[PDB]
């Protein structure tokens, strides 16, 4: 026939995060659909706010700084702190691992 066209998804990453957090826990196909909607939603939100931040400040480049500000505006209190913590770790580790 033809092999069905490629449909990207986050579901291998969601499964990998689930196995860190709950090693003996799995996830229904629907549940994973919701997880996929979630990730794409918050991507849109952070990215769109970052788009605006750069635009407001006459900048052509979305940097880790715009992401961070976008996250501060978008995530509630405790969630925003952790997120800013995990992003800052990940950049720092990345940069030193060139």
């Amino acid at each position: 026939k033809r092999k069905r066209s490629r449909k990207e998804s986050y579901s291998i990453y969601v499964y990998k995060v689930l196995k860190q957090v709950h090693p003996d826990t799995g996830i229904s196909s629907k549940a994973m659909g919701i997880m996929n909607s979630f990730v794409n939603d918050i991507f849109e939100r952070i990215a769109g706010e970052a788009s605006r931040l750069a635009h407001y400040n006459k900048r052509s480049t979305i940097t880790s700084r715009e992401i961070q500000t976008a996250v501060r505006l978008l995530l509630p209190g405790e969630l925003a702190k952790h997120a800013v913590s995990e992003g800052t770790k990940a950049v720092t580790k990345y940069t030193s691992a060139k």
């Binding site: 659909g33 909607s37 979630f38 794409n40």
Partner: protein, 102 residues
């Protein structure tokens, strides 16, 4: 006469391409089903005027979402409304839906 010279886009004037062309189905939103939805919403007692009032509201909700879904359909030159048309429609209406795409 009618009203309008050019109605070739609408495609209206359609019958006997197999059975089709619908009925009056809002009554198929039964009083029991409306009471079930109100139960999920924590409602304990329901005036008899609620059922017809709800069908009114459900209808306006569906006209608005479907009008925008079908707009996405027509734009994509399709004849089939996809789940993504509805998901884009609902996000527009500030009624963001998870678990059918995007």
């Amino acid at each position: 006469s009618g009203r309008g010279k050019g109605g070739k886009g609408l495609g209206k004037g359609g019958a006997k391409r197999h059975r089709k062309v619908l009925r009056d189905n809002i009554q198929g939103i039964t009083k029991p089903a409306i009471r079930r939805l109100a139960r999920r919403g924590g409602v304990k007692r329901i005036s008899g005027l609620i059922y017809e009032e709800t069908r009114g509201v459900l209808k306006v909700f569906l006209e608005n979402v479907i009008r925008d879904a079908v707009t996405y359909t027509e734009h994509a030159k399709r004849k089939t409304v996809t789940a993504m048309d509805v998901v884009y429609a609902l996000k527009r209406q500030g009624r963001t839906l998870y678990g059918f795409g995007g």
